Amino acid sequence: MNIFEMLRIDEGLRLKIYKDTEGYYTIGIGHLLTKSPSLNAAKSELDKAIGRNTNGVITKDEAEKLFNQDVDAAVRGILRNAKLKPVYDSLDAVRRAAAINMVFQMGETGVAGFTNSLRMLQQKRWDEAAVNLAKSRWYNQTPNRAKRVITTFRTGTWDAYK
Ligand SMILES: c1ccc2occc2c1
Ligand SMILES: [Cl-]
Ligand SMILES: [Cl-]
């Protein structure tokens, strides 16, 4: 198991523009196109990201290409964030994957709001962090996914993904 497989499991793969759990236009492997309520705006953003007139549909390869780009950006974003980096540097390889998953999902900003959990993770107090992570909108809105990520930080293993 690795970050790519983990996210592929959490996000699925769709080749046609769709609305995510928050109702925002997305495509591929969880690639957010726009928060705008307009499909046209979404189709424009899509064409711009792919570099062609897509008509709201992309191929598997194009999807995987966006995904590669998005994973890379998440990681790089964590390493550039002064709040995040030190936490991430402190983690083992499995837990780093859980950290990337959360940023991929909610953005660096979204995560930057888990200040108390971050500190717990940094201190390696696993069970407590797990409990704190669960007291969040994130958990209440996407409970099954959150459970898997939370178990990952708790255990340091891929059991939730098997
Ligand atoms: C970067 C570093 C550590 C993290 O813990 C949870 C999210 C996250 C992101
Ligand atoms: Cl893009
Ligand atoms: Cl879920």
Side-chain angles (χ1 to χ4, degrees):
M1 173 75 52
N2 61 60
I3 186 54
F4 288 97
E5 300 179 342
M6 187 203 203
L7 277 162
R8 164 92 187 47
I9 281 161
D10 279 339
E11 303 287 352
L13 163 65
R14 304 193 64 193
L15 305 177
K16 181 47 233 238
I17 292 179
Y18 65 97
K19 300 194 194 174
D20 77 356
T21 66
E22 303 275 305
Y24 295 134
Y25 292 118
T26 304
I27 193 149
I29 305 153
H31 179 84
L32 173 67
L33 294 163
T34 185
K35 287 160 166 187
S36 157
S38 168
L39 178 62
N40 299 297
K43 282 165 165 233
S44 250
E45 280 302 308
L46 181 56
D47 288 344
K48 170 162 69 74
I50 297 307
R52 78 196 174 64
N53 234 91
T54 65
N55 192 33
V57 186
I58 60 169
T59 69
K60 186 126 158 160
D61 295 352
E62 289 174 333
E64 275 165 356
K65 185 166 210 199
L66 293 176
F67 184 40
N68 282 316
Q69 297 168 172
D70 289 339
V71 173
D72 190 33
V75 173
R76 269 168 318 120
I78 281 175
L79 301 178
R80 285 203 259 92
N81 191 317
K83 262 56 199 72
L84 303 179
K85 184 180 185 285
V87 186
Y88 184 83
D89 275 355
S90 78
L91 299 176
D92 58 271
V94 179
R95 304 175 164 95
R96 279 173 188 187
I100 297 166
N101 196 306
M102 288 189 73
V103 166
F104 181 104
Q105 186 186 5
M106 74 188 67
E108 113 176 24
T109 34
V111 173
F114 283 68
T115 273
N116 307 334
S117 298
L118 297 167
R119 173 186 176 274
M120 279 163 208
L121 286 170
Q122 177 152 24
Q123 288 168 120
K124 314 190 170 300
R125 291 159 129 81
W126 323 115
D127 287 20
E128 307 175 18
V131 167
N132 190 263
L133 285 169
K135 299 163 138 200
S136 57
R137 170 178 208 269
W138 168 61
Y139 176 84
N140 286 101
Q141 295 306 135
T142 54
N144 292 337
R145 191 190 173 145
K147 280 156 206 231
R148 292 191 286 274
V149 174
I150 293 171
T151 291
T152 303
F153 275 122
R154 212 178 24 93
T155 63
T157 70
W158 296 108
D159 302 331
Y161 290 81
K162 312 163 304 213

